[PDB]
């Protein structure tokens, strides 16, 4: 139960790589709203380009080079985007060229994250169960750590420099490239009743009510005026509540069926998201705190259901019809976020983000109805 010399450099590489990746991706929606205040639409259009382009394009050594050039291009193009919009001449041909170039750096930034995760065959197949159990502590450390830290870097900026934190996050990402490289260099359908079980899981990917959702982050900062410090605290806590689901779900799976554990978890998610939406339409004084607090509670239900849906798939489809339904599972999940970010791209202003919250609760409640009806076989 001891990390090896090479196995430690693998762990130390995943930590440095993901910390820089996540911290930069957290502050990018904040930067896109600093530049374009009152237009969540533009931040949604940015990610729509990244989502599509990433899917299209998708070699292990190129990972750190791609992130380096991506963050480098992002800082140069974010600075140009900032200075040009601040001049006063809007909707130039030049304004579009910089944005699309900035969005092409987002595709490049995402490919580096995926490829560098591939590099994290080298661990002894006996010591792999201790290894794989450790990476979860590293991954958990970046989820809680980088949004919290990066939110403090973006929010505690000097007076006349709102994007002062963005470049500090990118300069971090560039300077860390020298550690990361040497570490990684050294050690490197039509008629199937189970289609409805997939579709119930898929609908939940249309909900914007996520602590790790970029659309919530833009709305929380722009319209609801939450500090990036408290938005990061929102994100880091959202990962901690999903951890609670790792105890709650095996415990209900013992005293109740695996179906009842998934049903009561997905039912819990819908209930707590319903409470959140009501307060979201209430006096915004202390109801924002309830709004975000109920989203945290709902993570236990969502992650509980995802473990059930995964386990139900593992026990229900035979190996012959397995990879095909995975193409279906991956399809519906892709289409949901595609629809999510396409619908958000059409928002006439940030304020009508409320109309995406409502469909989200509709989807979570609907996904509940579909699973309850399915689980009656
Ligand atoms: C390997 C070691 C790597 C060390 C990093 C060295 C980075 C140099 C270039 C950085 C690019 C410059 C970033 C642009 C700054 C900028 O444009 O700031 C705009 C200002 O905020 C007005 O809006
Ligand atoms: O929240 C987002 O930005 C988009 N999420 C939403 C899908 N979520 C479901 C949720 O958080 O409600 C997937 C998941 O992590 O379970 C996609 C992703 O995490 O890859
Ligand atoms: Ca990096
Ligand atoms: Ni999500």
Numbering used by the authors: 4 to 61, 76 to 137, 144 to 211, 238 to 426
Provide the authors' own sentences about this structure as they appear in the paper.
Ferroportin (Fpn) activity plays a central role in human iron homeostasis on both systemic and cellular levels. In vertebrates, Fpn is subject to post-translational regulation by the hormone hepcidin, a key event in iron pathophysiology. Hepcidin binds to active Fpn and signals the endocytosis and proteolysis of the Fpn–hepcidin complex when systemic iron levels are high. Detailing the nature of the Ca2+ dependence, we present the crystal structure of a Ca2+-bound BbFpn protein, which supports a model in which Ca2+ is a required cofactor that facilitates a conformational change critical to the transport cycle.
To delineate the functional rationale for the Ca2+ dependence of Fpn, we obtained a new crystal form of BbFpn in the presence of CaCl2 and determined the structure at a resolution of 3.2 Å. The asymmetric unit consists of a single monomer comprised of 12 TM helices organized into two domains, as is typical of MFS transporters. The structure revealed an ion-binding site localized in the center of the N-terminal domain. We tentatively ascribed this site to Ca2+ based on the constituents of the crystallization condition, and hereafter refer to the structure as Ca2+-bound. All of the side-chain oxygen atoms, except for that of E203, are arranged on roughly the same plane along the membrane normal, whereas E203 forms an apparent bidentate coordination with Ca2+ from the intracellular side. Most prominently, the coordination of Ca2+ by N196 and E203 produces a distinct kink in the TM6 helix between these two residues, resulting in a marked displacement of E203—the carboxylate group is shifted by ∼5 Å. In the structure presented here, crystallized at pH 8, the presence of Ca2+ appears to be catalyzing the conformational change to the inward conformation. Upon examination of the Ca2+-bound BbFpn structure, we identified a proposed substrate-binding site in the C-terminal domain. However, this pocket was empty in the structures previously obtained for BbFpn. Unexpectedly, in the pocket of the new structure, we observed clear non-protein electron density, which we have unambiguously assigned to a Ni-EDTA complex carried through from the protein purification procedure. In the structure, the EDTA moiety is seated in a largely hydrophobic area formed by residues from TM7, TM10, TM11, and is hydrogen-bonded to the hydroxyl group of S256 and S259, carbonyl group of H261, and backbone amino groups of G262 and V263.
